[PDB]
Amino acid sequence: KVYDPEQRKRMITGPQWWARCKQMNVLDSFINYYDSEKHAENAVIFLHGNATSSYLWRHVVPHIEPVARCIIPDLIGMGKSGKSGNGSYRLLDHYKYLTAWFELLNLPKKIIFVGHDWGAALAFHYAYEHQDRIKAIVHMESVVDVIESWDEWPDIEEDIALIKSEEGEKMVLENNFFVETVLPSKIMRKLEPEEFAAYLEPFKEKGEVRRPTLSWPREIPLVKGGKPDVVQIVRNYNAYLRASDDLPKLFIESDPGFFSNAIVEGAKKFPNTEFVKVKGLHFLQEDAPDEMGKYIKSFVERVLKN
Amino acid sequence: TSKVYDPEQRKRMITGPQWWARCKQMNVLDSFINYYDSEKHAENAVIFLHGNATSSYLWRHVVPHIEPVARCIIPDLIGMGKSGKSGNGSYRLLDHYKYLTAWFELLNLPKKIIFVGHDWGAALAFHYAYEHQDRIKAIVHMESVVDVIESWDEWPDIEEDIALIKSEEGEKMVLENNFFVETVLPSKIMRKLEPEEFAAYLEPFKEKGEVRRPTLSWPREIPLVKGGKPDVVQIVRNYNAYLRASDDLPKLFIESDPGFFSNAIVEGAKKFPNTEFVKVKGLHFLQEDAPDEMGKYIKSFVERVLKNE
Amino acid sequence: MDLAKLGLKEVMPTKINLEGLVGDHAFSMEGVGEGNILEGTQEVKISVTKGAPLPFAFDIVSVAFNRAYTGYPEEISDYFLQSFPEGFTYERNIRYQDGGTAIVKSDISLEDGKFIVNVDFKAKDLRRMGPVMQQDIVGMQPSYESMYTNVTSVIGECIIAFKLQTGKHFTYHMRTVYKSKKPVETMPLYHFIQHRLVKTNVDTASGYVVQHETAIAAHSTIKKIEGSLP
């Protein structure tokens, strides 16, 4: 919880990132998303996870832009994007808004996905339902498979049990559990003040606006007590990824990481995976952004040459 | 130190007076030496030499096993046990050696003698081996003064105790407080001695003062190459050199496990050719913890020595 | 603490049965005694019933001869008294400062108003010139055992200092996991148990030992700075 900073004046503040992002009407709401536009023959879509937004990739994507068009959305109800029409933020709602947003970008026939946390789950489900439209998948700290046991996982069993209970709604909707504590705790360095302000801005008020950060962990695919529909989704796409011999993949392990130790064994039963690793915990983008970007850039280059 | 009794030791306990009633005494120089003699089988003579703080009582349960094989003689050193006091009150190593040799000359010993030494009692034997190399047939030793001490690296934590003993403090450590009798001896025996057994050791040093001198003078002879008595150091070096060239002379080393000095001296004992090695469970006074195993080991060693003619 | 009812009174008798093996020396010991489970005092007479005499220092089996005999104040949860009438068990790992190791597995049950303790003590890799094999130990100095909660178990960790005839000391690290046989309602916060285990009735008569333990549980006595972490 201690932490100390690094180097400051290459910073991208919140408003600095948002003044570079675009917006677009999707279904009965709107999506905010960064777009590099150039080299539109390929599209790399960056999908953040819980407690974060597109801001998370701000220092990662400058490496991949000279070779492909990179689009990075704020998921619905998060970041600068609009809210979901019915106010619910389960996995399939994010999937609905995201797949509707996909139609309006004039994407290529094959898309590369760079997913983190639950964005990796969105990319995996979209790949399972559109198996031919995937050129490559890069994932990290991902929802790789269902959770049968807590052995190699971080000590979060009681945390998850409390979140799934009625305790979660005063844990996060009022005291902002995932933004005020989890997010700084899972970053190796101390975030500069405006960097944390950018993350807190969408959820700086108590109430239902922080609901997307409560519903994401309630989706966790445990075989015991987890939402049966989400466990079915994860089983399906995990089997598909295990069978995807022709799909190039890149796994960016985090050292020591957060989920990486518990998920590498599974992320690993997927063929055609190039394994790299960078220093960091969960939100590895704030610890090793340039190295991660160089890895993704060389991976995309090698995918595009064959 | 919380030690427990051997539950089967009382039924064969040999008390002090019981042991002393089985012993003879002979005039030696200007005093006398009390000793034990099994007499029979005088063709060979095996002599048991006790160390500091003890007497011939030390071997009371060890020596029966060997008796049907050879005549065994176990003396009390001068000023110790029931023996007489030294003429001039001095109890250095050579003071013991004087009376020991003069007592040797009055026993009708064979031309080649077998020796079983323990602690400083081994030194004596070793010394008598270096000065009469044709008079030795086989040497048994345990927890013995073997070679000099140039380092404490393998020895029990006795450096500061030795510094206190070789000081003025030792006088009140031993003479007025009976250190070796009432502290070292019971604490270096695994089993708890029966009250009569400890009384047998305490009786020669029951009263305070000068009669405890042999237990203070023995440690002050320790052959430390830095601080030790130079003549004792030269004696130890002499017989260490002689023992290193003893391919001819059979030996048996009884290692005490874990023992007291055995860990620091077994390597030096290895540098003695023709040395069988056996092991028994005990501390320093291993006789009080494994007397029968010791006795059988020594009996068979003596037998194997007396068959290779 | 409300003794109502873990099946216990304030002053409880106890019988302990230890089966031990040091290196390859097999032995058996029996303890008979009594104590006060609310003030944290106990006295036990320990006898060797098989394998005497011992080729090692006896004092290594002292901590194997019951945290029910602990004085817990009202502001700290008493896990061990909560563990009854069924009792508790513990698994204990000892690492001596020179190299030796020891495993102690014990079960504390309650029958007919008495604490029946069954202990298994095993040691290995004891150094030959160590104060346990040389029997250099006078006794155990007082100790402080850090106690804290781990879900349903309670972990205690301490160092134990054998005073020697030298006046020098020899330490060993002791980590114990205490598991209640049934769930208890309140698991305690981080605290300490101060132990003083002494050998009484010294006499020089006997071939047995009498040991008395005083164990007082308490929080720190230094005031935590207000606003400080943690």
Next chain:
Amino acid sequence: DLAKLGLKEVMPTKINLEGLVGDHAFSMEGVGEGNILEGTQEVKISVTKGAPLPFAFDIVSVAFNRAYTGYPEEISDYFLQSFPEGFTYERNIRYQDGGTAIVKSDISLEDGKFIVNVDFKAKDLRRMGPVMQQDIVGMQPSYESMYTNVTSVIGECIIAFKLQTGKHFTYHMRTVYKSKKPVETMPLYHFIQHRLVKTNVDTASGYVVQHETAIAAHSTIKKIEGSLP
């Protein structure tokens, strides 16, 4: 008499730490004051090289001077007796994870200032352990056993990191303190009770600030009149 030792009751201090955790080299520095008779101190630690740390900071908290120990009259203060020249210590830490750490430090006296120079080296840190995971909120109070071995003092300690889950994670720490000069009297077996806390850490600062109180004492349980030992 403190003035004879070259010390005053309130002493400033500056510390320089060179550390290597795993394969990560770093250098920190500390500035503080304290009371050497009562046993309080507060130091402001900042990372001069190696920022940011890929591990938990609190592992070097014990590395950032037993001169700040409140020794009563009935216990000899081995560390205050050790001045003007100062004293050194060699410290071995075994985390219950299985990883290890070595801390060698020199405490000298310069112009009424405790100049402490300390070297820290950790290895075998478990990936899912609280040190690598950085789950550590801080340190709990502790009791360090202090006894005499010839001319040196030895302290053994069980340090407990509190975790944000409420759980605890311990490490065994053995320190051999050696005075540079001989001292007139060596202490009997006793304890030093420690509480090390982080005081101002709530500021969005790039430095930690820790305060340790350490008070020496014997056991508070009465020895049964004529018991052993």
